Every structure is written in C-alpha cells, then in structure tokens.
Structure 1
Amino acid sequence: YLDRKLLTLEDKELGSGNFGTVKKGYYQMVKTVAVKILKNEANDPALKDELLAEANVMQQLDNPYIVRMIGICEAESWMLVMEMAELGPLNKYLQQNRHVKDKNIIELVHQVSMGMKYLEESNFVHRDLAARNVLLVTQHYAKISDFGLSKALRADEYYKAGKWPVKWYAPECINYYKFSSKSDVWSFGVLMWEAFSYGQKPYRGMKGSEVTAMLEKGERMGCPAGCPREMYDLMNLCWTYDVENRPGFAAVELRLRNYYYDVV
C-alpha cells in the first residue's frame, strides 16, 4: 500500500475502460508509473476484487517480460500503480502503426512467449492472454499485463472455474471450464493472429457459440496478409484441439526463438 502524497499524476488520461482510467504518473520510492484508477471511488465490488486479485498475482512475479507492480494506493479512489510501458496496448499500437515489419512482430510475440514460459514454470495460468493485454515499453520490448483472471495452479492439479473472453479460450475451457498452461498456449495463438493482423479483433462478427461450433469442425481463422507460413503454422499448432498434443510454452518459445534468428 502506497502513499498518495508521494504520487503525482499527469492531467490527461492515457486511456479508459469499463474499470475507469489509466494515467501516467511519478512515484517517489522517482519512477515513471502507469496508474489504473477505478471509476466512481471503486464503489463497484467486482472492480475492487479484480484490482486485489491482479495485484496479488503481480506481487509474486518477477520477469523482464511481465509488468512490475509498484503497489496499491487507496486514496480518492483505488489505484494500481505499475511500471510504465510507454507505448501501451499492442493491438491499439499496431492499428496505428501499419508500417511495423513482420520481423518486428516476431520479436515482440517471441518476448510474450518468454514471459508466458516463465508463467508456465511458475505454475500460473493467465486466462486472458490477448493482444490488448500486451503492453509496449518500446516498439522492440513487450510486457504482459492484466492478471485479473490469472490463477496459481494447485500442486494436486488444470484450474477448474466474471469475464469470459470466449474468442481466446481453448475447447477444453469452453466445454469443461478447465484452464491450463496449454489453455494459455491456445490463447497465445489467437494473440499471434491479432499481431500479424495489426490489431484486428478475432472472429469478427461471430457469436460465442458460432466460434465454438467453428472450432469443433476443425475450422480456424485464416492466414493474415503478409504473415509468413511458419508463423501461421505455429498458430495452427497452438490451435491443436487436443490438450496433450498441444505444445507447451517451452516448445512454443523455442520455435519462435529459432525462427527469429533465421529472419535476420
């Protein structure tokens, strides 16, 4: 818990959402920070619970590809103070910067696989791995954020189940509510598709049950324009229907690493 008097805030908001507001600021520990400010004095219990849960996960994680938490500030509203990733959500960035080269997209998504490989070996499932939850420190350095749905796996266990982002969820999540690192790997495939699609939403114009039927038939989203075949192959591997034949992040990270070194 942090001292509101050591925190200063820029007036203009970086962005907004259903939870409230994100602002740039500075905190004396002076670090440049991104501050998630809950709307309406955090009257909404689901907003407080999410802030508490994502803060409790972040406190346990330490990895260069995961956003670091500074702390919580209970002031005029509840505030989650994190290290600033200046450029913001990856999907919004690619929508506004169509010039980013395919090699650059591989570098970024590979870094996300490194943060997810770290999460995998830490026994955490993210359960909300989408391009909007990747934040850019620079155009060549991405970090994973938004741990509000993240869970630590139990030693005797798949996590068995608020928000339900069905277009990123694997078949065993939809049908059995079972979440694993392999479930995150499927979401990572969707995220790769978003990135090579420069921030297009997946399964545009489809309802939840329409996506589920589509996947059960073995159909998948198509290859984004300009996406190299090896990357589209990797997306299809992440979209392996069966949980045991789906690769883990150790394998996914290794394939992205090896492929990047070949591009340059």
Structure 2
Amino acid sequence: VYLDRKLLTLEDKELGSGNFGTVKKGYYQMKKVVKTVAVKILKPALKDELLAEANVMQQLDNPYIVRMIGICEAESWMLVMEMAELGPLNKYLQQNRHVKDKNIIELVHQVSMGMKYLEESNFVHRDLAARNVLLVTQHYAKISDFGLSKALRADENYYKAKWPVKWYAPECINYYKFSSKSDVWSFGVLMWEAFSYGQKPYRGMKGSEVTAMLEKGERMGCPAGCPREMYDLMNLCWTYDVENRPGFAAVELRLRNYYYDVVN
C-alpha cells in the first residue's frame, strides 16, 4: 500500500486540476518493469479525503474499475493509480464522432459490469458520470474518481449525507439518500452522454430547473442514432420511484443481452 518515492518519476506536464490539487502522469518502477501511472497529488484537513478515496480503491478489484497501485507520502500526499491513456469518455467521444453505436454499447456495458461489482461490494459511487469513465483503449473503459464514494454499512442499503445535481436521483436531492439505485440514475445520465457523444445533459439549465423538469415527469430526449432499446434503458434508469428503479444486475443483464444480439 505504501510506495517508495524514489521509485516514482512524475512528468512536469499536468494532466488535470481541481480543488484538491492536481493529477499528473508518471512512472512507477516495479521489480523488472516500469508501470505508467496517474498520480493524484494533494496541495485544510482534506488529507483525510484522499486517504478515504485510497481506502475505497484498495478494496476494489475489477477490470472495469481503475486500480490503485498505492499511496506515497513525500513533499505532498499522492494517490498512485494505473494509467488509462485515452482519458475521459465524454471528451473522447466529442473528438471521435465516427465511433459506432455498437462500440458505445460495448463501453456502457463495461461500465455496467464495473457498477454491478461495486453494487455487490456495497459501495456507492455518488459521482458516476461520463467524465469519470476513463478509456484504456477505444474498447476498454474503467470507472474512476472514488472521492465521493462510501462503503455501505452491513445493515443499511443507503448512505445519508457541492453536488453534480444533473447526475443525481430525486431521492438524493429530496432526502440526501445515496444508494446503488441512485448510482443507477446517474448511469442513465452517463448513457445519455455517451450516446450524445459527450454532450452535456440538461444544456443551459440550472439544477433547480432540472429538479423541476424531472418532478413534472419530463426526461431528456433520445439522442440522434441511439438505438430505441438503449433509450428505453435510460428511461428505466430514470424511474422516479427508487424501489421500482432497477439495480445494476438487471441493468447489466439488459445491456449484456442487447450487446451480444448486436454481435450475432
């Protein structure tokens, strides 16, 4: 878990920024091979946020989740993760419009598998969005950014709490209640983004107006070229009633079936 700072080389080129500090590309020397890494580098008591993130990531072990290599303490705190070279899903899709619906299905299914695993592990992501899906290849996606994630208690199926309101289920807004079903809501939004080639959801609207729209039963439209069955799934993810909204097992199962029908 604790990494040697002298085995780590960080590139001066920044990769991304935020109110924690930065993220940078680098290399971690293993026994005989060098591993390319993404390093989240810490700049009041937000130290414990990073350790919590690392603590969540240490427990997760799935192909469709970004792997933690370890933590490094030196000059600043540093969370070392494996590198996904192609970067965020939404930016990739914005710049690669030729990508085919079948490819997008493949990627969203991969995300659904990662989230099904996360659901089984009783973790809530609480920030599932296309920006937080990182591409290893055009055909391999991983879920990133566990800074807001929580391990559910063995007796509860939800967590009670600056929010990405556009990705949030009604019960998150109305009751501050975060569950794997609320991750499912966010996945619907993520799907909409993917099939819109990285377009922003609820363009030009304030959170309060988004909340108002959803309350009236209104939902985002079916993106250009999006198969109707995938849009059906988005709407199912946007089921207002948490209890009737499906879990990731059923969401994943629907994606799996549809995808392997497309390869047949």
With normalisation by structure 2, the TM-score equals: 0.94
How many Å apart are 1:15 and its aligned residue?
A: 2.9
Q: Which moved more, 1:23-32 or 1:250-259?
A: 23-32
Count residues in correspondence.
258
Question: Structure 1 residue 28: deviation in Å?
Answer: 1.9
Shift of 1:239: 0.2
User: In structure 2, how many angstroms separate the alpha carbons of the residues matched to 1:168 and 1:262?
Assistant: 29
Q: Distance in 1 between matches of 2:45 and 2:61?
A: 26
Structure 1 equivalent of residue 124 of structure 2: 125
Check 1:254–1:171 CA distance in 2 against 1; reply closer, same or farther (3 A cut).
same
CA-to-aligned-CA distance 1:124-180 (integer Å, 9 cap, x gap): 10000000110001010000010011111112211111x311111101111001111
What runs of 5+ residues in structure 2 fail to find an aligned partner?
none
Shift of 1:107: 0.2
Q: Give the whole-Å Cα distance in 2 for the aligned partners of 1:37 and 1:212.
A: 35
Q: Offset at 1:10? A: 2.2
TM alignment of 1:141-180, pairs within 5 A:
141-157=140-156, 158-161=158-161, 163-180=162-179
Matches of 1:76 and 1:98 in 2, distance apart? 42
Per the alignment, in what secondary structure is the counterpart of residue 41 of structure 2?
strand
Instruction: Give me the CA root mean square deviation.
Output: 1.2
- How far, CA to CA, are the matches of 1:84 and 1:138 in structure 2? 11
Check 1:138–1:7 CA distance in 2 against 1; reply closer, same or farther (3 A cut): same
- C-alpha distance in 1 between matches for 2:17 and 2:159: 30
1:18-50 deviations in Å (ceiling 9; x for gaps): 4332222111232211111233xxxxx364233
Secondary structure at 1:14 match in 2:
strand
For the residues of structure 2 that align with 1:164 and 1:142, how far apart are their CA atoms? 24
Q: Counterpart of 2:41?
A: 37
Once residues 76 and 224 of structure 1 are traced to their aligned partners in structure 2, the CA distance between those partners, rounded to angstroms, is: 47
When normalised by structure 1's length, the TM-score is 0.94
- Which residue pairs with 1:216 in the alignment? 215
Report the Cα offset of residue 193 of structure 1. Answer: 0.5
CA distance in 2, matches of 1:93, 1:17: 20
Q: Are the structure 2 counterparts of residues 89 and 247 from structure 1 closer, same or farther at C-alpha, using a change threshold of 3 Å? A: same
Gaps of 5+ in 1: 40-44
Alpha-carbon distance between aligned partners in 2 of 1:37 and 1:61, rounded to the nearest angstrom? 21
Instruction: State the percentage of identical aligned residues.
Output: 100
Aligned to 1:262: 261
Partner Cα separation in structure 1 for residue 78 and residue 94 of structure 2: 28
